[PDB]
Design an enzyme around this catalytic site. Structure first.
Site, short mmCIF file in Angstrom:
data_model
loop_
_atom_site.label_atom_id
_atom_site.label_comp_id
_atom_site.label_asym_id
_atom_site.label_seq_id
_atom_site.Cartn_x
_atom_site.Cartn_y
_atom_site.Cartn_z
CE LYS A 116 -3.67 -2.29 2.61
NZ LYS A 116 -4.61 -2.51 3.58
O1 LIG Z 1 -0.20 -7.24 -1.24
C1 LIG Z 1 0.87 -7.23 -0.46
O2 LIG Z 1 1.97 -7.38 -0.22
C2 LIG Z 1 0.40 -6.99 1.44
C3 LIG Z 1 1.04 -7.63 2.21
C4 LIG Z 1 0.52 -7.57 3.48
C5 LIG Z 1 -0.50 -6.88 3.98
C6 LIG Z 1 -1.24 -6.30 2.97
C7 LIG Z 1 -0.90 -6.62 1.41
C8 LIG Z 1 -1.64 -5.57 0.50
O3 LIG Z 1 -1.19 -4.56 -0.02
O4 LIG Z 1 -2.76 -6.03 0.24
#
Ligand SMILES: O=C(O)c1ccccc1C(=O)O
Ligand SMILES: O=C(O)c1ccccc1C(=O)O
Ligand SMILES: O=C(O)c1ccccc1C(=O)O
Ligand SMILES: O=C(O)c1ccccc1C(=O)O
Ligand SMILES: O=C(O)c1ccccc1C(=O)O
Ligand SMILES: O=C(O)c1ccccc1C(=O)O
EC number: 2.4.2.19
Lengths: 267, 267, 267, 267, 267, 267
Positions: free
Chosen positions: D143
């Protein structure tokens, strides 16, 4: 103050020079292969009367081509090759590998010739418009050569004129289309002011006092009259200027003649 | 045969158009915000006599701005806005969102004005030399506007002139420099030939029939002179046309006047 | 008037989106390979109270990933995911190939979360100063995220604040530096005016009414103070609002909290 | 080991810096014109407590702007300007042409402030999470700010946390969507393993042991539990951590406050 | 599962295709001008036995040239142009403007020939090692063609081999260099782990079971030898396959023969 | 004359090298982090018999990686590592920061190995074709690796063969498609000559004297016979050449084996 200080130490304008070189050498430079890399010396000649412009841009061409340049005239200098010198005046001395000089040649001159050409056309016009007693300003337009706006606007400045707004994000310019659409000029300017904010000026193209009324009204910073605020007149052709603050004309930069240059190696 | 077919369905020329739009809207288009997206109609007018050119480039600008365009004349049509009933001829009908038309307007006009200018200058010059018995041909040079070589060479063609070599990779053009370096016109041509191969021509700028012939036998494909093979004269302008295969001049493309155009909404 | 109309139909902002997709998929999209291309439906949820922003940018991401999107709220709508029955509000319905939705997901959310964050911070701050009698205006600064200036300034606008000058080419902002260098606020303004021309404003950061007035007469358009013309105060945050035309702060855009969003397939 | 050694001597990250400069100077730098190129000296101050991060990136800004920089603190150093020093601490001394310094200013600080801001938020969180006895790892997410992933991930590393997977090509991450589509988690992981091969890890988002069963089964390297293998928990808000190998949270990098900096010329 | 789904709907790979078209048409497409735009039909023929590969890349070339294509075999189909009745198999039917087909032709064929070549070499090699009891796996390397890594690694996959780490950011691969530098395989792995984190693997090139075990305990995920963890052998080619988890060789992708293709219009 | 002089001092070929580095390091170079920046020394070995090619390109990789290189052999030198030297021959000595060397390694070798590979395959073929008494020329094709045409064509030149036309804008090449479309070969060549002008050659692919008649007729510079002008024969496989001016074959560059290289640090 030095005009070349308007160009950021680094930025997209330098990549442009690189792209201009690639435009000239898509694959191999055969001529450079035969002429080799022997250190040579060359003279850069101006072959027509006019103002010297586009030095920093040409200098960037020589830097990338790894050459050493000695400029014998400051940018903005009026050159008069006709008196006579064999018709030419050396404005710069180049030193470096033979192939590098010959590679840099065409692009550098294509730059100087057009830049000097616009400055000369620019200076000639304001000079001529100012010799009538008109003390207002002469400005350009957005009718620049695609992809060469930075250099052409720059050449207007050295020629002595006003560049006017640089692009569509610089100053809001509402003409009849915009007004019809928002409806009222006070609404057109209202909306325009809503997004552009205080840091940018709003100019409105009017026909009758009516428009130029509500325009001044709503809070428009510049009023163009076509046929605590400024007045402009777009068209300027010949013979007259009458106490208007600005006369805009693409004549100072678009379709202007070029100032010829040449480059010849010492021997 | 249609000239626009010289341009590949996709390639760098289209990104060029995109970068030209960016040059004009670095951030926001305030005028577009006030004018909104209501469908509108507009007329593209030619305001000066001359050969229409730059149609596929202007069309690509209209495509990227998501507009519909109706061209009234084929590219290369000699326009004559003489009827003064207006002094203008509608060259195209444009339709689309109000902000899209106004955004595409300047960029497209700057294209058409310059392309038509060069096509015109190129046509009036090749015919001008045609009306003196000369049946050879007029060619351009590499003295093109930086970053706009493709458009300008394209204009020359529609204009009726030979574009000449496109860049420093499209012919070998050897001068004294390349001869002094290699030792003999034959050594220079041998070297140039060693890299360009059979597929590309080699031109030598001889200044003596004595050498010109060793150039002609060295393998040259074109022989140039200036103040089983072709012959060219490079330089200036007037009066004088011997039966040389080619006469080149930057006059057909560099420093030429533009052809005035304009665009207006129906309202 | 619609804000998204500030963005040109085509231009660099769209390539930006493309480069943002590349940033996330340098090589392959394994997850996309497992998930395949079956048509799916998804809900884009707003998970925190705040003003919705970044719609045209998120829409461009959905366009490049070849998806169909149904937005339920206009950009700038104050969302309130308070009903906890879910604590979320569906802001858009998305449909398309399964891999396309999942590929567009992160990038689009990162856009919406930050754009909405800034719009929100900008709105709660300009109103916060609005609820103290202050009727002037709140503006942003150049302290934007590198490479994301266009999106952040856009958010400020929807948020209700003035974006202030866009870059180092959109106003001249002179300080002691530029005055010491030129000799006098008048010399600095004369120089700035010599290059920016009539179309662009000039702001001087005076620290004395004595000079502020020579700046005001030198031709300045805006006068700044800090710890026929406008007046600005630049700096910090609390309690204090005199009747100065503008108050700028990086608080409306820099270091602001984001607005949580999420996307889920129908299944 | 030095963190800045993670950045390749040359690569796209340097062109990014160039693009950030162009974003700030679309046309001309008027201020730099008036201030000229006189050699100046300046201090770069940190005005808030926190960890210094983003040195190599800022250094690249100064290199391209051709300045000489003397860093008085290594990257990762905790700065405490509150004790007191006039509220500030000089962390670097800049020397070079006046215009160059003022040009490099905004971009360099916009980099440092955000980078330091993320490292500080990163360090604060793991430090706080590790003070509970939790010896697992704290990781970020994807994110990140569009176009600024390289710098933000880098800032997480200096702050002391794990960056987690860099992008969609780094580690396969299957959540409910992916599983439904391949059907079985053993099939989802099967296919994932088919393309990603042995060099990359596969993580599966589970709900019940069932999923986290076949997941461990098929050969998934990491299991995320949401609500010879590793366990992860995504969400981490406050108060508790319980012997899970990884707690992921965007709180360490997204929407974090910034660490203020300033730059002032000697005189 | 479909391989082409590994490629993002949009991203840098598509601009790659565009740049490949530019590489072939720097200026004009004379042949396209003579041939015009009449709709035509063409057959894409496979002229040599081998596995068909590069379909989505060839398809992107056909898309940008605005053509319609009908593929007769799924990607990965073992083609056998043995029937000599022709010795060729129509792999696709193409329709569109005559100039578009001829423009897309070379570029698309160069793609298919090389991609199919690598897929083929990769398949005959992994099976060749498969027919010797070896049940481990064959992997590629980083010895890929510059600028064509994505296409070549893609070919390896369809070919049935493991692609191995994609780049210098997709695994850490430590050698003596990294061990000498850090002091111990454990120090090197500790450092590598400090930056790559839990999400990415670390491979150590041990040359002794003594150290290989300290590497295995240092936290390594893969152990390499050459002339809770995986094991690899890197090098050459023949006869020899112990039960090592992986055997890598540049033979499946570098210096492989191509698979002849051709395209012909219906006429 | 030096082959490397064919490459412009600056141009897109250098940005290519930059793009090849980015392809290898999308995010961070973990290995370079652990190995640090200690000054090291390394040997670049050739491990197979063949001609050394691609020096300038490899040199550019080392420059950008800021290393110092000492070449022990000129480009074009035949290397024979088999006699024996431990199987290898050092052709260059590298000095610089450890991480820089290891970063530059893979890309530089991937360049040398393929370039040397094409030159070796090129030289072997012409040498073999010239040993039959055939004194004509051996040429390549346009069947180059996408995005690597500059280097591959360059390697053909060093290998001793003709590169043939560089791209679709170099020399017009009309085959059956083009002729059917313009109708007459004299018309096909007529139109072709209309746009390509005098500076470029026109080649026509014929079947019977008829075609090769009107072809020579219209003014075609090269006639290809497939099965004051030149003759070509495309196909060249084995055993014979018969006084034709040119035999074209992709065998000298496409699908050729590579010449192995390696780089090892001193200690
Ligand atoms: O996508 C990832 O790498 C991610 C990793 C850990 C938590 C959330 C995410 C996310 O961005 O949805
Ligand atoms: O180009 C134009 O139409 C124009 C004409 C006159 C002044 C200014 C402009 C402008 O757009 O900036
Ligand atoms: O560019 C020039 O000076 C030039 C001038 C006349 C003909 C050809 C050329 C050329 O170099 O292509
Ligand atoms: O960037 C800044 O420091 C700044 C701060 C406040 C207002 C305007 C600006 C500006 O320079 O545009
Ligand atoms: O590139 C190499 O030399 C290499 C060789 C074999 C396996 C892996 C690699 C790799 O570095 O990824
Ligand atoms: O690639 C081809 O079809 C080709 C084949 C033989 C010679 C030349 C070429 C060429 O197109 O330049």
């Amino acid at each position: 103050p030095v005009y070349e200080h308007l160009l950021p130490v680094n930025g997209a304008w330098r990549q442009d020079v690189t792209n201009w070189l690639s435009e000239d050498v898509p694959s191999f430079d055969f001529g450079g292969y035969v002429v080799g890399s022997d250190l040579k010396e060359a003279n850069l000649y101006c072959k027509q009367d006019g103002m010297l412009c586009g030095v920093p841009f040409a200098q960037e061409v020589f830097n990338q081509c790894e050459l050493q340049v000695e400029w014998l005239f400051k940018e903005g200098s009026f050159l008069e090759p006709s008196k006579n010198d064999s018709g030419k005046i050396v404005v710069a001395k180049i030193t470096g590998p033979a192939k590098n000089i010959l590679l840099a040649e065409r692009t550098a001159l294509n730059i100087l010739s057009r830049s000097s050409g616009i400055a000369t056309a620019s200076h000639k016009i304001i000079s001529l418009a100012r010799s009538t007693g008109y003390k207002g300003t002469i400005a350009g337009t957005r009718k620049t050569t695609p992809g060469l706006r930075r250099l052409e606007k720059y050449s207007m400045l050295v020629g002595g004129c006003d560049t006017h707004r640089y692009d569509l994000s610089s100053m809001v310019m509402l003409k009849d289309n915009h007004i019809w659409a928002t409806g009222s000029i006070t609404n057109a300017v209202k909306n325009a002011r809503a997004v552009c904010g205080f840091a940018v000026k709003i100019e409105v193209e009017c026909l009758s006092e009516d428009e130029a009324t509500e325009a001044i009204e709503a809070g428009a910073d510049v009023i163009m009259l076509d046929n605590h605020f400024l007045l402009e007149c777009s068209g300027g052709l010949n013979l007259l200027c009458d106490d208007i603050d600005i006369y805009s004309t693409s004549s100072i930069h678009q379709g202007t003649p070029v100032i010829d240059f040449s480059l010849k190696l010492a021997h």
